[PDB]
């Protein structure tokens, strides 16, 4: 049974250091490179670097200056060390096992980095759900967009068609925009609130987001995309 098992610390502050040691087992690290992969949340897998069997070490040229990966087969652990970490280091790290030199083969458990000073952030972060829709002519939908800070009414929803410009669905977090179906609606207050769409029509086939307008910077949400079978 191939074993790979991360230990990393969970939490760190701005500007300092991160040291993650991966514990393998079933495997020779003289035969076999070991990988760091890191995800964030809601983003794509992203490739930090390898040391292969023989100790040839590649980064990615994306952190090249501020990563370090060694090793010490008699313990079979391998070491990885990222510089001058931020907030967009925020993700969830893994150890990767190949064959050899060719397919990034298994997997370890990962552990999850947080990176924030204490403040929990600064900047208001809009989470949107549900990311993926497929919907059925005539049914009726909900998107929610909540807001890690009350920022009152001030949310906008906006559509936005395949190839075209946004347009504003919703204002002021209820109030349906100029020129609006009243199938649109919009609720909430505070932190949660609800775009619903009645009697789903084609032309609704479209990208929905939400956008915060209490402090700056405004924020949008990550979006949400409707599907029609």
């Known amino acids: 049974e191939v074993k790979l098992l991360e230990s990393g610390p969970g939490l760190v502050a701005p500007s300092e250091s991160l040291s993650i040691t991966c514990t393998i087992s079933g495997f020779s690290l003289t035969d076999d490179g070991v990988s760091w992969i890191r995800q964030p949340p809601g983003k794509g897998l992203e490739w930090l670097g390898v040391?292969?069997?023989?100790?040839?070490?590649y980064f990615n040229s994306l952190f090249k200056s501020r990563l370090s990966i060694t090793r010490d087969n008699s313990k079979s652990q391998v070491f990885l060390e990222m510089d001058s970490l931020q907030t967009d280091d925020t993700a969830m790290y893994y150890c990767?096992?190949?064959?050899?030199?060719?397919?990034?083969?298994?997997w370890g458990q990962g552990t999850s980095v947080t990176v924030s000073s204490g403040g929990g952030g600064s900047e208001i972060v809009m989470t949107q759900s549900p990311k993926f829709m497929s919907t059925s002519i005539g049914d009726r939908v909900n998107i929610t967009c909540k807001a890690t800070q009350n920022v009152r009414t001030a949310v906008t929803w906006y559509q936005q068609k395949p190839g075209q410009s946004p347009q504003a669905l919703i204002f002021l977090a209820s109030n349906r925009h100029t020129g609006v179906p009243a199938r649109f609606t919009g609720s909430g207050s505070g932190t949660d609130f609800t775009l619903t769409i009645n009697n789903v029509k084609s032309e609704d086939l479209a990208d929905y987001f939400c956008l915060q307008h209490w402090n700056y910077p405004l924020t949008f949400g990550s979006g949400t995309k409707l599907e029609i079978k």
């Open positions: 040391i292969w069997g023989g100790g040839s070490t």
């Open positions: 990767a096992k190949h064959d050899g030199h060719e397919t990034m083969d298994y």
